[PDB]
Structure 1
Amino acid sequence: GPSVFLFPPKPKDTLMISRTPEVTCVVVDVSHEDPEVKFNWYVDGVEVHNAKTKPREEQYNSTYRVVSVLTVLHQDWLNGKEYKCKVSNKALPAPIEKTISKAKGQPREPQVYTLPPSRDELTKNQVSLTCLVKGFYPSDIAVEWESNGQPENNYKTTPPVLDSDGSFFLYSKLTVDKSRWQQGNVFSCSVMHEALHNHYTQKSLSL
């Protein structure tokens, strides 16, 4: 009994035309008795025929895996067009269908706020710098840290929590050594979201 899994493009892939958003349809538990699989793709009902399906790979449980990837348009995804993957197999009484698209709802511009560290944390070895992004819809977002054009990598981004007013919020905490923050250095919190102008914004944070 095969099962089908569908995945959305990464949030950054759609916010800039420099990248290529894609939707991947994965089939697992492909029986050895009947390993033939056909992929039918549909976008808002009408069938599309520009899908690039890779040949099957046998897994270690003697079950094959077929993967079909369809490259989508940036504006089509941001306009909320449903993508449907149809998988047919001789071992399936009925074909399996999976649909995916952007979450419905009017886009909402996120608010970016940078918080200087608490006074209590000025005694410890390292100092936490926090960035608050709130009110953005949908949850597809990307937050990054850098200083003087150089990325910072000791940070963790929280999952988008559903706020009380139907919107989303999250926190991105950057961990830095004490000495760096004491020198009056400037750090920037970079946020990319579809409701922001040019799908990008940043705010500085210094002593």
Structure 2
Amino acid sequence: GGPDVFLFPPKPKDTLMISRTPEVTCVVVDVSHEDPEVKFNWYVDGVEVHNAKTKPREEQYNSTYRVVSVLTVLHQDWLNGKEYKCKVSNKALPLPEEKTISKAKGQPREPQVYTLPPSREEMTKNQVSLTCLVKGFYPSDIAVEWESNGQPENNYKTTPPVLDSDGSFFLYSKLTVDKSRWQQGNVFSCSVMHEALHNHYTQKSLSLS
């Protein structure tokens, strides 16, 4: 003992696509083997909200409870900086334990997206790297994926975002393809999601030149 509260954000990309339902999740742990009532109260910017889905408590293998409250936030609200208080009242807590969360703050910056060919040097090999530079973005929440005519591409990795000398973020995502696919003339396209982009999406294509 005693109770600890953790409040978790939605996934970046559930926030970046209107077609998705982003949730903030409120988790309470160390609720006593003994005193098991827990109340949740939830607020958006101060106004109390009554829509959260609270689950029946689950007993952990360490003789302690754990209770969860999911609130669904609106695409517009989250992106618009609204603040989300989860307030947790136990009879084991002398003051309700509270926690607030919102999207990452700071002026939004729209990423520049660049696609880069394989070096003269890589062209020896039986596989090549296609490179997606994404720079000057802010905040760091981002999703990056590759696709080729319709279906997406397996063999890609993306770096975490890195903080740049101007307070902004950059990132590279590397697509690896069979050299035969690149020389054929197959179009490849790096798609980026970020809040600051129009409709939070853009896409840059790269082809054999």
Paired with 1:30 and 1:173, the residues of 2 have a C-alpha distance of 45
Identity score, percent: 98
Question: How far did 1:189 drift?
Answer: 0.2
SS at match of 1:144: strand
Higher mean displacement: 145-154 or 176-185 = 176-185
Give structure 2 stretches of 5+ with no counterpart. none
RMSD: 1.4
Q: Which moved more, 1:125-134 or 1:76-85?
A: 125-134
* Structure 1 residue 134, shift from structure 2 partner: 0.8
Deviations 1:87-116 (A, max 9, x none): 121222332211110122222111110011
Name the TM-score, length of structure 2 as normaliser: 0.93
**Aligned equivalents of 1:98 and 1:160: distance in 2?**
26
Query: How far did residue 37 of structure 1 move?
Result: 0.8
Report deviation, 1:74: 1.0
Q: Structure 2 CA distance, aligned partners of 1:122 and 1:59? A: 55
Q: Which moved more, 1:90-99 or 1:15-24?
A: 90-99
1:54 CA displacement:
0.7
Counterpart Cα distance in 2 of 1:126 and 1:93: 62
CA apart distance, 1:120: 2.1
SS in 2 for 1:57: coil
> 1:66 is paired with a residue of what secondary structure?
strand
Q: How far off is 1:175 after superposition?
A: 1.7
1:116-172: CA deviations, max 9, x gaps? 112222223321211111111111111110011120021112111121111111111
Structure 1 residues not aligned, in runs of 5+: none
* In 2, Cα distance between equivalents of 1:12 and 1:198: 12
- In 2, distance between residues paired with 1:122 and 1:3? 55
Please report how far the alpha carbon of residue 29 of structure 1 lies from its aligned counterpart in structure 2 after TM superposition. 2.0
User: How far 1:188 sits from its partner (Å)?
Assistant: 0.1
- 1:156-198 Cα distance to aligned partner (Å, 9 max, x none): 1211112111111111111222222222211000011221112
Q: In terms of mean alpha carbon deviation, does 76-85 or 172-181 score higher?
A: 172-181
Q: 1:176 maps to what in 2?
A: 177
- What is the correspondence of 1:44-193 to structure 2 with a 5 Å cutoff? 44-193=45-194
Q: CA deviation at 1:85?
A: 0.8
Which digits, 9 at most, give the CA deviation of each residue in 1:10-53, with x for residues without a partner? 12222222111110001122210111111111111221111110
How many angstroms apart in 1 are the aligned matches of 2:46 and 2:189? 44
Q: What secondary structure is seen at the aligned counterpart in 1 of 2:56?
A: strand
- Aligned equivalents of 1:115 and 1:63: distance in 2? 53
Give the whole-Å Cα distance in 2 for the aligned partners of 1:93 and 1:127: 61
1:179 match: secondary structure? helix
1: CA distance, partners of 2:41 / 2:170:
37
Q: Which moved more, 1:87-96 or 1:112-121?
A: 87-96
Partner secondary structure for residue 182 of structure 2: helix
Which deviates more, 143-152 or 41-50? Answer: 41-50
